[PDB]
Design a protein around this nucleic acid. Sequence first.
RNA 1: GGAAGUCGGCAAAAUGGGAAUUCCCACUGUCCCUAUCUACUAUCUA
RNA 2: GCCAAGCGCGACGUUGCUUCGGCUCUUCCUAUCAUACCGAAGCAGAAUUCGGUAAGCGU
RNA 3: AAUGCCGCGGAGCUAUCAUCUGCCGGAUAACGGCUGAACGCCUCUAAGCCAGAAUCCGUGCCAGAAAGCGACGAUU
RNA 4: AUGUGGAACGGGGUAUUGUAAGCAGCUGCUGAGAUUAAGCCUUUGUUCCCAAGAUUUG
Lengths: 225, 35, 132, 403, 166, 114, 91, 339
Amino acid sequence: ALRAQFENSNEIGVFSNLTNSYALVALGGSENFYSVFEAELGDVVPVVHTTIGGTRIIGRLTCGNRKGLLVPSSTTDNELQHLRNSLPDPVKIQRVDERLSALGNIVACNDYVALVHPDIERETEEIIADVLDVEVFRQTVAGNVLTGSYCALSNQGALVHPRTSIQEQDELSSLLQVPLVAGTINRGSDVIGAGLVVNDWCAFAGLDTTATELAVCESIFKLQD
Amino acid sequence: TSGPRDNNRNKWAKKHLKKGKRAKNSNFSKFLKKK
Amino acid sequence: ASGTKYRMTLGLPVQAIMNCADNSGAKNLYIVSVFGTGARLNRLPAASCGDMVLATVKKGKPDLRKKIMPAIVVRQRKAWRRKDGVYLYFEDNAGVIVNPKGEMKGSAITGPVAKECADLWPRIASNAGTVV
Amino acid sequence: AVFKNITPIPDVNTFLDVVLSRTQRKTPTVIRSGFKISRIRGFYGRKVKFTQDTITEKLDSILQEFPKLNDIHPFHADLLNILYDRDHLKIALSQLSTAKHLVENVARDYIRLLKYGDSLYRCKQLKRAALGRMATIIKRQKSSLEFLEQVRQHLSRLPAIDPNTRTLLVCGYPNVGKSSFMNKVTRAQVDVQPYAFTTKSLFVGHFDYKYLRWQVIDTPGINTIEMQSITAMAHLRSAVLYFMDLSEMCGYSVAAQVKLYHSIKPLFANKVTILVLNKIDAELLQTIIDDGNVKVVQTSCVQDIGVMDVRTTACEALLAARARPACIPDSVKTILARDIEAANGGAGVYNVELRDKYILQDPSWKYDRMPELLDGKNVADFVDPEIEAKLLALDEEEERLER
Amino acid sequence: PQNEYIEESIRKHGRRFDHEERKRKKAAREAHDASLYAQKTRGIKAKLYQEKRRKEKIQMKKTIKQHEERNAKRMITKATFVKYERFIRPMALRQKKANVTHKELGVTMQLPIIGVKKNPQSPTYTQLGVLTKGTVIEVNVSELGKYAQITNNPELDGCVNALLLT
Amino acid sequence: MRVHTCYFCSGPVYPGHGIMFVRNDSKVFRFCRSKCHKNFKMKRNPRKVAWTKAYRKAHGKEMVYDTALAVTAARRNVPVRYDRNVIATTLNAMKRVSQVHAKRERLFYKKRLA
Amino acid sequence: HFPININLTENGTVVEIRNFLGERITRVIKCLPGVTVSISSAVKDEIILEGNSLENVSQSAANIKQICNVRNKDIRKFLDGIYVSERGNIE
Amino acid sequence: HGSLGFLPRKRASRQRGKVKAFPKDDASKPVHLTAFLGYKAGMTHIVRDLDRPGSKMHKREILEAVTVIETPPMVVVGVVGYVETPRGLRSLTTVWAEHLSEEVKRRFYKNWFKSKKKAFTKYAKKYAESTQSINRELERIKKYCSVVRVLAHTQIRKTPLAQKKAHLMEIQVNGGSVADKVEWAREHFEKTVDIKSTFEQNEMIDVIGVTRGKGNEGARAGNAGYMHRTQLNSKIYRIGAGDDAKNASTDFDATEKRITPMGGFVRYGVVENDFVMLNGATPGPVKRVLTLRKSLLTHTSRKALEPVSLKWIDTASKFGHGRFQTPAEAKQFLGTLKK
RNA sequence: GGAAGUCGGCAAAAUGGGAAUUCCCACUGUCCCUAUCUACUAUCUA
RNA sequence: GCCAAGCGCGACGUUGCUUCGGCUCUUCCUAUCAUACCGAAGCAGAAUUCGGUAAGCGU
RNA sequence: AAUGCCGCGGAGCUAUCAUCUGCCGGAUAACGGCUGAACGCCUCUAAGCCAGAAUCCGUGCCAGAAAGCGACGAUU
RNA sequence: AUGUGGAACGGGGUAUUGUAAGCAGCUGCUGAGAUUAAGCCUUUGUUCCCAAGAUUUG
């Protein structure tokens, strides 16, 4: 796990998106944030200096995994084409005409199993299954419909609200077929998806994340070795 | 913050002028001038 | 606040009652003061999308009411021009209850989220469902 | 107390000069005799009230800035009493409070007297009398200002110890190597000199161990310095790390050091005690070991060995007392942009080009743009990879239809 | 930091390279600085320097002298003490406690005003108990009753300061 | 750079021109002019308004469809790799489609007049 | 903490000072006529100003010192700066 | 009240905005002009990529309103030499070209129709018979005068304006020695200087002119309008060519089209000659003569230095609510009309 | 936006309403912050 | 009161307790709240305190 | 049908309800110094000289003397 | 004071409104018709107009 910060904002998950085959970073801002991701993933997966819908919240506006990526319908055509040139061919890119454009905020997906918004459209779910090639579950995280923001989901670990019950924790972990931990990030910031981005071999947390939280995510994610 | 008549700011404006900034401007004039 | 905010048309002056868009239980927000108002003579302070103002919960839970405390406007009735040139206006004047740090007291919001508000406040964008 | 934040307290003459200068520069200073008696009385009253407000505000700020000894923590209160004679400090604060009340009472009487002002000379005499009486009161409370200024400077320079968190007290024989161990363990580097009780005041050093913050607080060798060390160890949730000179190079015999440790055991009670044998490489010890609480850890002061082991043991004692596979790439298993941008134009002056970071087959294609919309139709949104063959097949179909 | 942290850095890093010479230059040129100040300055701040410098000269002259010796509407507008009361005696101007200095003892003790003996301005003012210069008033002397004559202007001074008739 | 279609007039909406309106259902209405925007505000039905494209479509006054050159345009949500020759062919394809679409624009009007 | 980088141009009549207190502003000073600036290799971080006019040389030293001035910082603790060490003759 | 830097508050004495300050003359720079005269046709709005480092909208599209001024090439008909005196600059002498067109000659008469067209007849005669006097005057200019200003008049005939008087003005010839300026002026007599030679689309110029009169208005009342203004820091977004049909067409748009909006500019007509597109507004209404000058001081701000790459230039009918850039695609969308 | 105007819902629009001068609801160019139109006045001429 | 350089006073020091009233407006003054720059202080940094120049610009 | 009523409505006007633009040189005050006497030392000052405030004066912008002026064109 | 001259109209472009009268069986002729410079653009269209009166000026 690494501590990174976008400008003076510790919610690197909002301003950037991380997957197991590519990295997404904002556009036109501080070059330090892009360099931080490049130093850890430049020689592994391509990093795309892009913006969505003319916004710096691409992390919470876009949802996708190592195979495919989804952007809201409000994404401009020039932004859509720029993503395709930067991203490699084996990474599918698809637009989503959804009532909730915050795909990253409403869907928490790993490479294999995805948890989506309870009110997500059927057509959106079909597109997710087609492009992401993942099993789509329509449930909620800690009683809050924004699964993509209140749950940080990876292949070997997941993080949710600290307020979830033990039985809800165990049910979610069993459904997600992954170990899961109820905790907080960024010294009490309960929005783990906004304050934490993790791939299958590396994790990136906000600069305000406590050492205890950093030790916890490293242990559950088993990325020490 | 100081205004446009700030003596230190006028010093810094000269330092921009005494480099390629005014330069880029000179040959840019020379191009259309030799046209 | 993160990043500079472009100027946009003001349509939420003081003395305005506006709809409260989160799930914290508040219903009506009453604007009392606006942050970042200069000394303009005989000018009513006004609010726009993404601007933080002192709001009082008119309707909602008795406990969170009686707190003149900052609220971020998320939807504005008055038409405003984005720098791309297009004009936008929302049917309702919607705001979100937020702490001075920049984190929404509620857990979820209802209705579309103005993009200018979303980029300004990362926590709001994190808690946003539909950013239009 | 340690929070400081108290505004500087000037001398009696300086305080009077500031008050008078503020009064003259703020209140109007032109009252001609031609003005009505009510205007003359009002002008004198405003000047008297403004001077009273300035004096009262300065006194109130000093009183509020001064920490409350009674409300402070027992360790802070004891340290303040030992180092600054809390009884004298309380007396000085009471004297200033009495002076502030006297000044306010004098101002009220003068304002009431000026309410019935008869002539400009009478008003001027009354206003001058009020200011002089206030100045005399401030000048009378002179030594208190100097005492408060010295107290404020000492409080500001005092360490910001945190007894609530886990701490490791380092007290014992002077120059027993505890300061050297604390300096090595923490970022703080307490000066070590051959003079006895060189570190007169306590030095606190924060350290991290097993994701826990420990405040290593060094104390003077056991005087005012010794009294401060005893007071700090009296009320502080911490583990004692008494250092006994095994080599006796510090100038105190092993029996003397153990006797001092046994005497100080009353303060070390209900805490994890460590009988660190300093200068190991360089009877009483048996009794200390037999005490049970005292852990025997050898730390070679001359060889600088064993300090880490002692710190780890002390920290442990204090803690005891208180199908989803990963597609990890081979490269992951096995100039930066920020440097490039800074060398190119710097932050905010260089334009990063996204064309270079593209997977286009031809570099010319990546560097060349394409028409977004043409003839009212978006070429970007209506040009497909199969359009190359589609257009040719379409043209043939149109030709066949025409023929 | 802790305690004398600049001193530790001064001990461990040193004082400013030219601090000694700059302080020497400042002291040397202070004479020209003071002289230029005394002529350039105007207004109150000049007058404060006028009075302060005169005081310094006087003390400096004495110190050398000791050094040589060592080598070798109907109302009353005046302060009063309490038909016949036709005029009004305001409470604020009315005063009950007298600061009277003893002559032989040379001490100032604050005594209650027993009464007014005689006001030289007017026997009507005497009857009204008007406190003015020359007015002799009786005060209790048990803690030291005896009369005392007012040696100031109470209505101008704000305090009734007198001398005992002893 | 997308030239959108007005909701009401179904006409070409260019940058700057007209207004964009977002509904609580996140659905976006783009209007080419004030006349169309106000007509949406009084909620008049486009097919029932005499001058709208929707009226001219579902009243027999305009063609159901034209597969001119077997393809005219489509909303492509899958981005395509750039190719100079492909971007060339579509541009020639676009004018050929427009010319043929113009050709049917004339015969059909002759058919309706007949 | 921060090394002070000094560059000499046209035999030293202009001295460019960079990385003072970590600041990114390049302080450029042009010496008075008749003054040449050199960096002596005998002693590290040492600048030699030799010339004919004592007025020009001493003024050049004063200008360089005043340019590298500490502002808003405790001079008691911040010792950063450039100061004249010796004043003598070439022979 | 407003700024006292404009308190004269009176009608401008001049219809054409007079240049009051010229850029400082430099001998090192070779010889070049510093000002040009155009006619305000109107404005449109465009979409441009925002290549502004550090800006919130870096690498994004923005909509900018841009004023279009038609600038047909001017004819250099004469030269003026200026001598520095302890009382200011003095016009020592003036030399005109042999042939002056009817456009500039109309400037010398209030009633050109009743006139005998006698202007410059003897000057033309003396020029043809003996050039020694012309050579002598030119030698005086290059020997005594320190400043050289060419007399240039706009070819208003090309513009779609009923006015037939040419706006003759002076342009300071900055660069090189006084002799070099004199040589440049002599070689350019009777010739045309195109605005492409003066401006190169990547400099931010000062546009000066008389604001539109707002009539009488009611700090005392009086005239509020028709005043001489000097807008600073106005970037040339595009110097189009009248002959080229790709002038309005960008590289991201293709769609061969002309800058003139469909139906023509409102109350100006159609632009057929070289035009200049400037960011933002300019003083004065349409069909008013506008003077453009090089910036007196070098300001190398990031906005003043960034390049411009146009994407799409709106040419919809500004009359009414235009919604069709060219009649071709207007016919393509609209069902075929009975006409 | 909706009484933030002013000592104040004066005048308008609402229809004004409800409840005990006050409160609630509604309403409006009173106000932010003015803008546009019309006739007359005003102007010049006999 | 004690001293008390000095010329019986006697300076600085020292003892003694103690109708008016306010909106807009125009300018102007600096006896400056902010903005700009300096000086001092246990001023580490940050936030200050005090003191200068200063009415350009706001309040 | 005193402009009967309603919807839309160009053109014009208009809106921080819309959009553009808003500049450079020296000279100083406080203050920091350089050389340097007075006063065989010393000293920012006396004669001299640098650094230095949103200050000052210019530049730029607005007006143009309706009793300031220049060059040029043609000549009843 | 005879010209890419000017003015009246007229055509076209362009805009606004919303499918006209009339005919036939809500539909079609009909996004037709009306208005369009009055401070919109353009004109190889038609017709007409002017190669003057008065005043002052060395």
